[PDB]
Amino acid sequence: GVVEEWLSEFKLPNYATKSSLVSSLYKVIQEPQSELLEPVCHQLFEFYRSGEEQLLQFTLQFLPELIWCYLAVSASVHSSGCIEALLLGVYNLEIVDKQGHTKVLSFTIPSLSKPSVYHEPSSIGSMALTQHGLSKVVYSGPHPQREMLTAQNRFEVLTFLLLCYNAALTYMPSVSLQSLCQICSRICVCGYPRQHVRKYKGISSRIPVSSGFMVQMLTGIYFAFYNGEWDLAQKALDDIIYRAQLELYPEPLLVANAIKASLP
Template identity: 60%
Template sequence: MLGTGSEPRGVVEEWLSEFKTLPETHISTYAGSLHLKKCLVPALYRVIQDSSSELLEPVCHQLFELYRSSEDRLRRFTLQFLPELVWVYLRITASRDRQSNGCIEALLLGIYNLEIVDKDGNSKLLSFTIPSLSKPSMYHEPSSLGSMGLTEGALSHHDLIRVVYSGLHPQRETFTAQNRFEVLCFLMLCYNSAVVYMPLSSYQAVCRMSSRLCVCGFPRQQQKLWREPCNRVVLEPEFMVQMLTAVYHAIYNGEWEMGKEALEDILYRAQLELYSQPLLLGNAMMSSLPDSAPDETLGRKVLQVEVTPTVSRISRSAITAASIRRHRWKREGKRTKQPLPPPFFSQLTHLICCWMQYL
């Protein structure tokens, strides 16, 4: 195992050489020991950030080889660098210096082309199933729906409604202005599907990427501590929604300050561009945040939802026209003109988005 005092270049060079000589039978053991190399990940970040580094091309090739392996831990090791790779790629693309972007572009396209097909080479179709309203959940009770023709028998026929959210993507050999964000959105979708496995350094990278992509070339950049020269980067709303998904996870898993700053910067850019999707999701996230950093001991229990208690069924014979009139008059007598607070709608929207995403 490499010592903590090793030079960054030596760390990367040793990592490049050791995998080439690794027998097939030792890949699983090697994958389990990668997290022990404490100085390897920071050294790889330095190489990726330096587009003039002579180690960049072999590092990108090595990361692709790890991603091609059948070992999930090696694939996740490569995936943790995706936010930094996307940031460097878009920054260089905006500067129109395409010559120093070739190996990163090839790596991103390689990961994309691997992910759009299954192990048999067939196109993937990513989908989720809408649950039946006839079954109770934390969001509703079937009895609260009433008897407006929506009987359990009728609803049960819709148990297997499948909604496709990504699929049948064509293979890409190069980036163009037309397909760039189609590829990058899908790559961020892959990253978000494995975000729970990412280390803290990757959460920092995705927050850093989100902030810089959203403010580069705008007046808000002057308020930042970093002063890297960067042209304005064109962004699409679907890509910003994927950024918000990753940032939200980072906020609740150790990166409160960086995550909040990234969220504010994404909202800043979405307001300038008048993008409705990131505005809706970003405002819902902002409204649902607590006043201070959540207690890390709570972990993923920070988001709590109260379950509606089961309502006992009322027989139809007990409901009469007179009882309906009394109930209506009672409600009208107690009605006030105070509207529901805006955070209610934003929190409800956010809960629905999270529910649909993780089904």
């Protein structure tokens, strides 16, 4: 293994740069049936440990692999059960480790009754004069931590680790949308008669992903349409429409259908 030599040689921002580890990942760590992916992932935790955005934003790009293999094998053949706490540690370092406080995401709604950077409400008639203006709403917060990943908040944690990708869209590479949207394309219809048409191989189990996970994965597909990945994102979002129709989640079929009526 070339990456084995890499781990043998490594173990201060100049150490960031690297395309040799991705190709040697293609020729060494294409197979997930090796249990030495665990500590190097912790080494990927080291690249996540510091505040350097570079090591994060192009060494974070292989975790959906271990989500599908490690988590599809684990959360259903042997399995260790450790990197759920590594991803959970990433969750803790996302909700807490900015300065030492928990993260409370909250925007404020605009208004047509308010002067703003783009318009004026004063010279216009009595339509938009009068509604809760200049008021704030909360959309993600507050959110406590978790010690070890269990099945109550496995998809809450997965949900906000996906919300980490809801803030770092443009910095992604195309391969991230490739594997991320193929694996996220197969997680949704995995235990249904739709994967029979998709013929996506793997375990034939229905994964109980939740509604928020589907919304904040629809934002990701919606970023995947507009980087050349057209047909994969199209069939993926169609699968989300099907899963939302059988599962009767309103808002993912709401959003995804709004995508279906928003493509040329």
